Homo-oligomer: A and B are copies of this chain.
């Protein structure tokens, strides 16, 4: 659902007549054509309209989400793979590949291409997508990342997908760079938070499992810098888990303390998790505990 339409919906739903736009110096005519599709609209005018309709800033940026050929093809593709419709998903990747190779370069297009290849490869038992294609494209995107000095949340999406695909080693130092860049601002979008939270939890888990103590400490320090709201109880808990690990690695606490902690957790997660998720979480804790025990040899 397009922006013009959405604004018309708020405007009629809030009984604001067209005259008000004109009183605020936004031509109603140009506006009518904005909702209609016969004209564009400057962002300054949109700002005036959102104050008129008492729309919130996030409420506004949320609608700015474009709808290109790429965006459309990618939502069709996602709905195809998630509904297990693999004929559609295959045909959409082939079409999109042709469009991608003939049209103009865009990073958003590149990341969508990679994403289609990756998901087709991971979920379609009869995909024709090859590991070679995936790796060629992967290496283009990784090289852009290496040479970049600014990162955004879609770069982090790309790294989580690359790690799930598992065709090449995961670039660790690069993950640090991406996290640092993305986290220089306060993250306000719950979908980005979901991605970041999952990446850091997995990152901490993989680090413990490696038993590389300088690396574990590095990950731990990133984790202690990562800010979580007081109402984000799950991340509050992972911060406490990371802190307990830090205290055992540095001989500030002993395994008895860890066990007391772990038992408390295991009794609490009944309230928040389905029992499947519960068993997984416990499994993670046992693996952490084992790696820790082995580190303290």
Contact = CB atoms under 8 A, between A and B. Distances in A.
A136 interface: no
A interface residue count range (under 10 / 10 to 19 / 20 to 34 / 35 or more): 35 or more
Given A64-B60, A271-B240, A189 B188 contact: yes
Interface string A11-54: 01111100010011100000000000000111111111011111
A254 interface: no
A52 B106 contact: yes
Contacts of A109: 51
A154 B10 contact: no
Contacts of A9: 150
Interface in A176-191: 185, 187-191
A60 B52 contact: no
A289 B51 CA distance: 44
Given A66-B51, A106-B54, A230 B277 contact: yes
A268 interface: yes
Interface stretch (A75-83, A164-172, A231-239): A231-239
A70 B51 contact: yes
Nearest to A53: B107
The listed residue with most B CB atoms (<10 A of its CB), out of A25, A42, A144, is A42
A13 B56 CA distance: 28
A271 B270 CA distance: 13
A214 interface: no
A64 B52 contact: no
Contact of A107 (B14, B193, B234, B271): B14
Nearest to A21: B104
A86 to B, nearest CB: 27
A254 to B, nearest CB: 20
A26 to B, nearest CB: 10
A149 interface: yes
A61 B188 contact: yes
Contacts of A70: 51
A43 B40 contact: yes
Nearest to A64: B57
Given A54-B108, A58-B189, 18 more contacts: A10-B150, A12-B150, A14-B150, A46-B64, A47-B65, A47-B68, A48-B68, A50-B65, A51-B71, A53-B108, A53-B152, A56-B152, A56-B153, A57-B66, A59-B185, A62-B189, A188-B191, A264-B271
| Chain A to chain B: the 5 pairs with minimum beta-carbon distance, closest first | A13-B150, A47-B66, A54-B107, A58-B189, A40-B42
